[PDB]
Design a binder for these strands. Structure first.
Ligand SMILES: [Zn+2]
Ligand SMILES: [Zn+2]
Ligand SMILES: [Zn+2]
Ligand SMILES: [Zn+2]
Lengths: 72, 73
DNA sequence: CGCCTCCGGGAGAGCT
DNA sequence: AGCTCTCCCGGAGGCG
């Protein structure tokens, strides 16, 4: 019942991966159109409920790493 | 207490443009997509309510259409 | 028919 | 503005 991107409470399988609603819509938005997203740390930011908003680059990386994809 | 505009049963929200109950939503989608041709056994003016709605899909469909229901809404 | 679960996705409200 | 994230409602696939 835990999101594989941020460990918040998961709402189901979204875009192929067990995720929360937050990460589901974050990903849909990130994966379409152009976004810079630059990490301010060392591309290993902590992405949990409290901090996931801080680094969209690291959050997006984790989405991809977990296997999220539009085709699913 | 929100009432389906087609059959007066308890509405479940705004479906296809119109405040309807779940059964009317489901019925409407099926009616439009099976291109169903229904025939009224009366005078094209049946009472459509929770029990009677089953009797006359012709009149139920007509009412759905007259209320503004549309799949693209 | 009337209902169910599951998931995509728009609206919009509220941040920053 | 851009972004976040929950309220609704859509289809698909299924069941009694
Ligand atoms: Zn998450
Ligand atoms: Zn980062
Ligand atoms: Zn109804
Ligand atoms: Zn009739």
């Amino acid at each position: 019942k835990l999101c594989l991107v941020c460990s918040d409470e998961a709402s189901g399988c979204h875009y192929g991966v067990l995720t929360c609603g937050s990460c589901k819509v974050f990903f849909k938005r990130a994966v379409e159109g152009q976004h810079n997203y630059l990490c301010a740390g060392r591309n290993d930011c902590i992405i949990d409920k409290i901090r996931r908003k801080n680094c969209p680059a690291c959050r997006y990386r984790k989405c991809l790493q977990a296997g999220m994809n539009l085709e699913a």
